[PDB]
Structure formats: structure tokens, C-alpha cells
């Protein structure tokens, strides 16, 4: 996520200032600036478990296909649940099941 | 026999139902040089193989000497080990490009089961046998295998008569 | 070594060919205003016993560090031997609980060229072993003598 | 009372077979084609053009008649299958259209054959409908007969079903290791009206892992070659600032690696900074011209994104939001399919497949012959003009090209001309 | 249940030849603008008025592949047009699709869609007959006296359609139903016989929620498989 303009939005870049020697995001489009607080700027990760909550919505209760279990919830302690595994689609990707509750509608793992 | 038959059936699917249950807790030992859904993949076919096997042995076993069919089989004029066991006990598990029945649907097979099934009756294993007749989901299952087998055939013939001119060449 | 499962564990290991790739998990570019000392905690105790503001961090992971059966001063003897002194490094031992290993261009706007040698640092870096094989199994053979 | 056992669900099956019978779509396919399509054909182009003594002619309603037969004595009787199969003709019914000219001195019920159309049996203007058992077994027809097939020269024709991918929708597939192409979108652009198809836009993601230099994203339009990168073509559709872009493109400002993998589009298209340049850079790259200056090329470029860049949305100006929200989705699900979390669609899903019965085939077939025909009468028309002699407006029309290509189609099996 | 898994010729053509199942259908073609005039009167939100920013759960809505708007409250709109599909008011060969997992809502009226019939199994809790079928025995009655209870009329295979008990479905649509292969899979039987064929198991589930039930599986053949007796019992090549 990186930091858009104010008067032409578009998103600056990182750049290094001599005379305090700081990290600053510049625009080239004009001449806007801003103080940079954060040395981290670029993260490329080789394998990654990122993405595996899916994208659960609170209308995924009443889809007749996933299969329902009865898991004990967390807080509230339901009987009833559904359960399905994750959706990224990587060769190396674990078997782990993911539940979801009826009553509070929130995801927990078996850890 | 069709007692034993059933016996070792069920006992076969509580290892399937096993095996799931290791590889949904991250418990399942993985194979070297092969993914973890690779290596279950691989156990679960192993143990139904395994199953149909006994089945058909047992099957076999309980053959009378005046049976037909085992006279034909032990004059070797026509029939095997394989069609008795399918004739009998089981036909097994239908396989396709090496594996089990895919996901055509979205994560199922057919929409008669729930996403994420992993069980053998939910991929294309067959436990009636021909004399029992077949439900509609095996039935289904075992025309596409058998279509497989018809197209795998079709396209081998011809590559092997193109090889043979050539070589005759 | 035919009769030794050591032996032939050992030399299995270094036949296979491992990369820098193979390893790293994740890679980062930070800002270190002060080469004395960094910002982050974890590593402030490394920088501070081992001694262009831009800094490239490695975090590789444990299980495949040790599948290897590599240290940290083989990759680290590597990774110096093999760009000379045109980048200087600074290596953590396994104390550090985030398995890092910093490199500094040499001095002599920077950020094009230093995605390039991450690239660079990323693909063509290899450790040990011959080129070309992906994979080693070890297959028992039975023989008549 | 009771639960429904089988006995109930045969009675349900045996109700659905007497309603529909076994050749139900068939029949059905070209009720519908002979029912409105015709219409629809003769509608789509009504004008034809040549005080400024203004030439106009109106196309009106399409009548049908039963299928008759003529003969070299001139007379004309009702014709039946049984009589065409046994004398080797063609069961056809005539078609009549309205041409009425409306000169009218500039801006200051002809009832015109136009051809024979080919009647399919026991379709809803075959004469084998209404009638009953006996004047059936009268008329040497089996009761058994279900129909569905034509009769062209005394032989009984059957149309197999055509499959084909479904049009208006968006695949995302992968590609094979020798390519700079890692994934691929796909969709195929037709109009509701007619289902015909237009043309095929594609969007290709260049760059393999760990190769490639900048992992570019580049859009493919018809009418051009070297395709221009995505955030040109966001530029040229009309929205200039790239935080409108990502915007339109990632709905979700958590996804960082969608960002990171979109920032090299936008080191790539910062060299274009605002609509107009865009506009030029297409139509330079846009083909179609050469050194034909820039007027031209932003009329091009104007032409090219408010026709022919996906037809089946919209085809006029001041509504471009929705095209280039369309494209946004678009690239959102090929980034979301290169990010490894949706699997590439399925080709043989039978889902996203359709079937061309004798409807479809038949609509397109009579749009090409009255393509053919109306050109053939402008041809006429303009050498009775330039001849100076007045036509009677029925030798100029020609029903014998529409009639040919219909049997000659329905015949031999080749689709075309 | 939409081309006969049996039925393919041999040679260059086999696989790629299909003959149509027995309850097979094509669609013919409705128009869509009603479909529009009707999404609009349900609360339709325009793709003018769309911000990001705010409508970072809004569900797209897609009809004949075109994205026409969003809306707030996919599962009443989804309900109600279904209701309304099932009522007579929309043509009964429109695709209806609701996929919660990528939050997209799909209308389909085009040309070429291949469908089958189905039985409506009653999915709403309120309802006192949930997990049973809408038809009962007085449809089956009134289909066998041919007329309804109130000549003037035909009680056949369209009644039925437009009574909200048998509904097309396509392929596509498939995805987004739970089907029984049989009524009697409709209630959870409760023996030891070696002489019928054993039915899966189906426990991996705790409880089923079947919304459509097959008419009846041998309806998946074609017109020549349908003339083998017991093809279940043999194998598919000799099908
Ligand atoms: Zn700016
Ligand atoms: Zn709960």
C-alpha cells in the first residue's frame, strides 16, 4: 500500500533527502512531497500462507453445498457449523480445515 | 463370502475415513519428492486397491470346482482373476488419467455430494459389483473411465501404426 | 558407502543441487539512516556487537535451513566469495531468532539497481551442488554377488 | 395422503413426453427463427439510399403462405411431404415482404416476393399440425412420424446440433513454459440482437517468472496490431489520474501484492501522462494509416474504443463507465487467476457451451442472403439509374439467390456460400 | 442428466459426437429488459453512482455476461426472483446464479443454454413441509384427470412448471443446488439384506439440506441407451 497525491492522485515513491538525510515520498507528476516514517517498502515472500480465510461473507450461512458439522464454537459454544478447506489454489497447500458458526458467524481454526 | 466381502469393504473405508482424518490435522507422513495431497492421494488409491483385491481373493477362494467360470479360468480358454472379482465381489475404484475421479463441479464430482468430500463413494469407487448392479453416481463414474479407456485406445493405435511404417521403413 | 546409510546420506546431500532460492522465504528493502545501529529491535543487538542508507534483509526458514543441512557461515563464505567486495554483508548466527543476513551496496536514488542485484541474488546465487539435478532418491538395489 | 413413489415420478415423466415429445426443440428452434427472427432481419437495415430527389424505400411485414407448389403450366396448388418426397422436390412456402417505395418528392401492399424458405415438418406452418388421424393416414403420412427434418429435393435433411463456447463471458487460462505469456484473458464479444459474432478482445500478461524484465499487462483490440499495455488504453478510455486506476482495478486496499504486482504497469504508462496522447499513441500503433496525421488518428482511436472494444456492452458515446468498469473486472480476475487463488476456468465445462440448433444457423444464413440480395438490387437499381429507365420495383428483386443458397445450404451441408 | 454418458460413436468422432438425455432441453431466448425493470424496482443500485470506498461488500450483478450494477441484500433479491421465476412471471428458461463465494449474482437469458427438469425440494424454515417436496398426490391427480379442480383448461407438464414444483436447471446453475438422487434420499432412513445393492454412506456431512430432487436417474440415457435392459449391470463399452 503505497501513499497516492492529493492534486493529480497519483502514488509517490520513495526518495532520499541529503541535507536531513530522510526517507521521503515524492511525486514526479508535480511537486508534492511528504516525510517518510516507514524503511519498509518492498516484501516479496517465496511461500506464503496468506490468503487462506477466503473471502467469507455473512450470507455464506444458508449455501446448501458446504458440508455442516457439529465443532464446538469458541465463545458461544454452537452445535451447529459448516466447515471447507482453503481457497488458494498452491501446488503445496495444506489439507487444515476451516470452520465457520452459524449464531456468531466467525471463523476458528482446530488450533 | 458376500459377508466377508462387505466386512472387509467397511473395514477399508474406516482406514479411508482414517487416512482423512490424519491428513486434515497435518498428521500424514510425507512421501519424499511428493506434495502432501499427492501422498494422500496415493494411500487412499493404495488402500482401495488393496480392499478390491481381497475381496476378489476372497471371492475366488469360495469358488466351487463346478463353477463355470472358475473351470474357464483354470483352462485359461477365457476370463481372469480380475473379472471374476468385479463379476462377484467388487468392481473397485474408477480411475482416470491415473487418478481418481476430479472435481468437475465446484469441489465436487457430481452435485449430488457437499464441496470438500473426500470419501471413496464421493470419487469414483465402485463397491457393488456387477451382479448387484451399480448406483446412478458409479454408473456415471464408470462411463468415464470407460470413455478414457475407448479414446486412449483410439489415439495408441494410430501412433503405434505410424512407429511400426516408420521402423518398417 | 554402498553399506553405509551415512555415508551415502552424506553424499546424496551434496549431490543435490541447492540455490539461494531454494532456501530464502522472504526478502525486504529497508532505510538504515545510522550504519552503527538499525531501527528494529531484533536485529539492534546483532549490529551492535558486530559493530547509501539502503539495506537488503534475507529471512529464510528454519525446517529448509536445516533439510540442507547447511550453517550460516557456509551461505554467508558464499554469498561474500561470490560478488568480491563490491557488497559489503553482515551475517547473524543462529542465536538471532529472525534468520537474517544484510547486504549494503558498496558506495562509490539507488533503487533500480538494487532490485536488480536482489534479482540477481535471488536467481543466479547457487550454494553447492551439480547443476542440473532437481532431485536425489535413494533406492535400495538388490544384486547377486 | 402419501409420500410420491415411483409410480407418481413415471406419471410426471409420461406427462412431460406428451406435452413436449422427443423433438420438442427442434420444432421449437425453428417456430421461434420463422416467428420473429425473419422480422428482425428485415427490420435490422430498413433503409436503403442512393428539393434532392431523396430515394427512399420501406421494408414492412413479412407474410408467409402455406407451402405450395408451382409448376411450367403456372399453376400453383398446395403441396404436402408425401408429394414432395415422391416427386423430388423441395416442401417450401413463399415469403412476402412490403417493399413500398416512398419518393415523396424529397424531404420537400406491394406484397413482394422475395424467396422460399424451407419448412421444417410438423413445425408450427407445415400443413401436418392441425390435422387429425384420419386425414393424416389420408395423406400417406405416418402417424408415427415426429418430424424436425426438412424435405430438399425429395430427401429428408436432419440439422445436428452445433456446440460452441458461450459468447459474452470472461476465461482466464494459463500457458505453456516457452512463452513470455504467463496467463491469459479471454472474451468473445456478441450482441444480444442476433447473436452474431463481432470480434475477440484479449488481455495476455507478459513476463514468465523470473523472466521477462517488466511484468507488463497488455490489452489486444480488433483492428489493431502491437498491442498497447492496459494502463495506456485506461488512459485513452478516459480516466487520467492512476488513482482512479487501481481504484477501478484492486476493490480492496489490503491487497498489497495485487498493488505490487500492478506497479510496473504504472512505471511503464507513466510515460503517458494524459487522454489526448493516449489517443495518439493508439492510433499511431492502431494501424489501419500511415502518416495520415494526428486528426485522423484520434478519430481512429475515437472509433476504435466506442466500437469494436467489447460491442455487446454498449456501441455510442458518453457511456465508456461501464466498458471501462468491465475492463477493470476483467483485469482483476486475471490478477486474481495469476495469483495463484482462483484455477483457471475449465474449457470443457459444459456449463459455458451452447448449442446452434436449425434457430441460430438458419437467422444467420438468411442475414447473409439478404446481405447478398439487398446488394444485388442496389447493383440493379444504380444501372437502371444510370441507364435512365424507370423500374417497376418487382424484376429488380431476385428471389432465385435466396432460394439457391437456402437449398444448396440445406442440401449439400456446407454452410456457406 | 444432459447428454447420454453411454451413446458416442468410435473412431475420429468418438467423444466429440453427444445425443441429447431423455428430459434434455434448449433454451429458446427470452428478452432481458424485464429482467432489468424488475432488478431496478428490487433496489438495483447503477454503476454511475458506484463508490469503492463505501460499497466494499455490495455484490455485482451480471445479466448476459455484462456487469449492470450492485446490490446490498443479495439473498432477498436472489429469493425473490426466484420466487418470481417459479411463479410464471419469468420465463422458466432463465439462469439463475448465485455464487456467495466470489459475491456475484448471474442472470442468463441467451440462446443454446442446455437444461433438465427437476423437482423443488421446500428450503425455507418457516415452511412446516421443510426437506419435502412441493408436489404432492393432488398433483399427481390432477395430472392424471387432466384438468383442474376448481375443460376449461390443461393440467400437464406446464402446470406443473409454473405451480413451483418442477424447475429447469442448466449446467451452470448446477453448481449452486444440492440435488437427491432419489425421494426416498429425502428422509434419513433409519436389516442386513444381501441381495440389494448397498447405497453410500454420505456421513461426511452431520446434516443434509437438499433443495432439488431427481426425477428419476435412468432419464440420464439417451434414445438408443435407453433401449438396453439392466445396463447398470454391465460395462460402459459394451453400453
Ligand atoms: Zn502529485
Ligand atoms: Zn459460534
Redesign the pocket.
Known sequence: SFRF??????M?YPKEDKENQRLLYS?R??D?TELAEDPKVYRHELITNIGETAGIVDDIGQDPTLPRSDKECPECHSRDCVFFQSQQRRKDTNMTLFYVCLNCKKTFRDE | TMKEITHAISSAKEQVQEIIYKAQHNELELKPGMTLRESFEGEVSRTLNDARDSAGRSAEMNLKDLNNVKQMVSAGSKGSFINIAQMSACVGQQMVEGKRIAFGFADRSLPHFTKDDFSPESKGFVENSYLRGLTPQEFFFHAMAGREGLIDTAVKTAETGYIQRRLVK | IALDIEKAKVIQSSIEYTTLKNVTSATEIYYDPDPTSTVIEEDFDTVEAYFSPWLLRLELDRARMLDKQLTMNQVADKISEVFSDDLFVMWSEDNADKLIIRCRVIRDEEDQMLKRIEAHMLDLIALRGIPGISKVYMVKHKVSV | DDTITTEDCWTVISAFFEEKGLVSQQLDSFDEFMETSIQDLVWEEPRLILINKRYEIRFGKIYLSRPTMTEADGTTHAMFPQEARLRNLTYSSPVYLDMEKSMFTSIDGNKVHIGKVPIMLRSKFCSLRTLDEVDLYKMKECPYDMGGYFVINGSEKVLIAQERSAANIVQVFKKAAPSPISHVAEIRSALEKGSRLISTMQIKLYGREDKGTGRTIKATLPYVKQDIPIVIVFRALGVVPDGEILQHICYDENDWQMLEMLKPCIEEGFVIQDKEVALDFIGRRGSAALGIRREKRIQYAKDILQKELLPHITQEEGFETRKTFFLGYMVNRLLLCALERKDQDDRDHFGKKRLDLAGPLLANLFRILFRKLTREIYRYMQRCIETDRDFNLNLAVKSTTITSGLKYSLATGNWGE | GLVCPAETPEGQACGLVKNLSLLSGISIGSPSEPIINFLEEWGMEPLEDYDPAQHTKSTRIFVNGVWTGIHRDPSMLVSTMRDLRRSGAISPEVSIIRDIREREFKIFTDVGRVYRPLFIVEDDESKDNKGELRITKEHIRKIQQGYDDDEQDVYGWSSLVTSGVIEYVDGEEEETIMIAMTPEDLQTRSLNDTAKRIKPEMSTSSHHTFTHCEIHPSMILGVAASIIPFPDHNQSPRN
Open positions: 497525491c492529493l492534486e493529480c492522485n497519483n509517490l511525486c507528476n508535480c508534492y
